[PDB]
Amino acid sequence: NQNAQALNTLVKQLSSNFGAISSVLNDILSRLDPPEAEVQIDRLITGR
Amino acid sequence: LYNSASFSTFKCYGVSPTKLNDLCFTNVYADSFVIRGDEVRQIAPGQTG
Amino acid sequence: FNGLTVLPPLLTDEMIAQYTSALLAGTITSGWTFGAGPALQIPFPMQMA
Amino acid sequence: SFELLHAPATVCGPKKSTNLVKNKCVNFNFNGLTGTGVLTESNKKFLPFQQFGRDIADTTDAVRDPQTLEILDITPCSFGGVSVITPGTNTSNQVAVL
Numbered sequence: 001n002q003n004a005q006a007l008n009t010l011v012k013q014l015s016s017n018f019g020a021i022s023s024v025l026n027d028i029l030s031r032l033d034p035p036e037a038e039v040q041i042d043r044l045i046t047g048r
Numbered sequence: 049l050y051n052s053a054s055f056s057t058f059k060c061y062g063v064s065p066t067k068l069n070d071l072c073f074t075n076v077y078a079d080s081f082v083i084r085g086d087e088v089r090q091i092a093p094g095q096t097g
Numbered sequence: 098f099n100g101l102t103v104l105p106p107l108l109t110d111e112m113i114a115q116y117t118s119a120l121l122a123g124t125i126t127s128g129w130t131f132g133a134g135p136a137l138q139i140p141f142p143m144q145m146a
Numbered sequence: 147s148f149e150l151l152h153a154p155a156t157v158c159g160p161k162k163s164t165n166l167v168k169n170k171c172v173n174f175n176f177n178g179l180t181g182t183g184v185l186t187e188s189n190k191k192f193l194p195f196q197q198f199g200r201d202i203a204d205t206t207d208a209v210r211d212p213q214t215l216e217i218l219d220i221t222p223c224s225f226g227g228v229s230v231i232t233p234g235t236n237t238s239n240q241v242a243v244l
């Protein structure tokens with residue numbers, strides 16, 4: 001139960017924004033060009 | 049909209065300007081009004097006046 | 098799903114049960130002698146005595 | 147003013163459509179939803195107000211298609227780590243790959 005709970009919160013922490021505009025990487029790479037996308041990219045990489 | 053050179057203040061946060069046709073949006077809220085000349089800065093998220 | 102894997106153990110459950118069956122048959126056949134040296138056979142009432 | 151997905155997607159762009167392919171690893175674009183995976187047949191009976199199915203932790207599991215309304219399943223493409231069995235470079239250079 002402890003391993004499954006840690007695995008479940010490891011999966012579930014992708015849904016957090018960590019200050020970025022969206023949790024999913026693909027739509028923010030689809031809707032921002034890189035020199036202002038990278039501020040959201042750095043926050044997502046830091047949180048994950 | 050992008051290729052029209054009559055505008056000078058396209059000025060788009062949120063979705064980036066150069067890749068805009070590729071997403072399929074759900075609700076577009078086309079508001080319209082007329083303002084005083086130096087109030088360009090107050091229509092922006094955060095700047096108050 | 099997203100790039101996390103669960104590796105299987107080196108010893109499967111049949112092999113762990115074979116290890117415990119070897120331990121069980123060794124203790125009911127020999128007492129404490131197989132854990133020390135060679136397995137020396139015993140009658141089991143004499144082992145419990 | 148936009149909102150980015152309070153609703154099903156209604157205002158698309160002028161990009162041309164592409165014919166669909168079954169059971170292959172593709173980079174799909176489902177009304178602005180960009181993702182990777184294979185597109186298989188699904189037996190999940192959706193009620194007619196759904197436009198997409200959503201899995202655990204903000205990943206999309208099943209999408210019904212534009213122009214056809216036929217239900218599709220999104221399974222991710224086959225991945226996994228690679229591993230090397232070696233006897234050591236002192237003995238031989240013959241390599242088993244796991």
Ligand SMILES: *[C@@H]1O[C@H](CO)[C@@H](O)[C@H](O)[C@H]1NC(C)=O
Nearest residue numbers: 232233234235236237238239
């Ligand atoms: C390589 O293996 C042989 C025999 O296994 C051994 O004698 C030799 O010392 C090994 N080479 C090194 C550099 O240890």
